[PDB]
């Protein structure tokens, strides 16, 4: 794949929770890092690599 892209997912809330002050407060979001991965701390001996 190409360079890892960030696609943000904005969905409507569940109809139990559809009450808010402003209009964007009915929608709650999430970021999905596409084609990347999660990782621990890299060793300091190969930080240059």
């Amino acid at each position: 794949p190409f360079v890892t892209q960030a696609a943000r997912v904005i969905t409507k809330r569940d109809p139990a929770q559809s009450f808010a002050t402003h209009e964007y407060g009915k929608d709650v979001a999430q970021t999905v890092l596409v084609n990347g991965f999660g990782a621990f701390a890299v060793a300091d001996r190969s930080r240059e690599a």
Partner: protein, 344 residues
Amino acid sequence: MDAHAINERYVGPRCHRLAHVVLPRTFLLHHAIPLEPEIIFSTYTRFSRSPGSSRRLVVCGKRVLPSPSGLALSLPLFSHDGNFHPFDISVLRISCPGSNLSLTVRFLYLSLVVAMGAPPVRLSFNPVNADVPATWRDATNVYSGAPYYVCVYEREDDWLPIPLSFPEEPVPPPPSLVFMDDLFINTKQCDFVDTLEAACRTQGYTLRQRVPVAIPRDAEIADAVKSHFLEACLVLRGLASEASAWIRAATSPACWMDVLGLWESRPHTLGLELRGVNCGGTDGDWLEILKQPDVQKTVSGSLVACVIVTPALEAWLVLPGGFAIKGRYRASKEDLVFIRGRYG
């Protein structure tokens, strides 16, 4: 889907053709339309190459609960002398009766006209019905880039397409005739800033106090207030909006105020009315300005400049620190007929 068939009996005859339009949520999230049943819609169209105004009409709109889903409306189309114009904006104005909410939604006819293209005596009884089927045809708004649906209901009709009368030479380019409003207001704003920069040259590139507000003693603060004037000149030039303060002052029959969001930390609120304050320029009248809750935070706080416009089209740029510069919007008599027709 009831609001289409209601409008054909009450808005329907008062027009020439209707533009049945259903707005999806992707359009509603962009223009931020909070769907309550209290909403009163109002529609009017802005003509081109003619004296531009049509009358205002109230159109009923209902939420459609689920094949699309969203707000359902009906837009009026006006045919002066037997034909449509292609570059002719239909403006939808959305407002609540009680609260502070005014939204302008703008449509173009070529996105709509193309989208329509494929013994006791008897008393009649004709109720409103959703019996007529719908044909869903796609579209995109030119101004925002959010898709909206158009219904085509079944009824010298099939023989002819919908009449259009394209403009004639010499003609400005249609990227400049579509945005007739945003190139008119932008040149008025760019000529407003040039009065402010000319007012510094006559004073010797200075900023004089007008509002008595004490300043804490630091040299970096005196450099910071100068940075609020240059940032406000990047904003007033870049701003070209339909509902600015001086436009409400030109179509007023009272000082008209709009604060600004400097360095993009705030969204702009435009057209705030100063009720009961007469901007005469005397030192008695600035105290009535200081009783406003906005002007206290534009001066004591930071990152917000403020523009106060008189009904004589003379305007001051209030900076934090109490500094102010008198400027003037220049509107000719030919320009006021252009503004009071389309906007007011």
